[PDB]
Design a protein around this ligand. Sequence first.
Ligand SMILES: OC1(CNc2ncnc3[nH]ccc23)CCCCC1
Ligand SMILES: [Cl-]
Length: 167
Amino acid sequence: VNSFSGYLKLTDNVYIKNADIVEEAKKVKPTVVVNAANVYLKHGGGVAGALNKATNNAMQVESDDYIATNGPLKVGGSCVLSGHNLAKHCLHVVGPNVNKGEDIQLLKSAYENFNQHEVLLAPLLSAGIFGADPIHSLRVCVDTVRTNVYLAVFDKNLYDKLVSSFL
Ligand SMILES: OC1(CNc2ncnc3[nH]ccc23)CCCCC1
Ligand SMILES: [Cl-]
């Protein structure tokens, strides 16, 4: 039993809700919140900009030190950093950016990072401002993630579409 409330069960291990991941994080304080990161950990907009704003820019300050030490992430890769006031940890995961010509096959690699964590609050990677179809992101999620994932979908219209077309 966990404290996620109001989620629609989609499969054995995937749950979904129309919500802002920032608000879900502030209410639940999960062990792991997933950020829809880019390779430079520049949290300007979308999920990343919203999460970083909620940390009063502490996420960005920590991220800049991470990059200065380690260099950029790989597309499909991830790193674990602090969750600040939103979660214990933030798993920064880089899905491919369709607008940059990046390989959508890397979306599966991106979701594989979730399997290193027993329970996560997460967005549909590569969707939103990253350019991919959220319906596709959801199918890759369900077919790749084996740990327990709670998805927060920001847009009500797309959520209803994601639910309606699922089975
Ligand atoms: O959910 C997405 C990605 N974008 C966000 N998701 C959750 N919470 C958020 N807070 C700010 C942005 C944001 C991907 C699926 C279709 C709708 C948009
Ligand atoms: Cl977005």
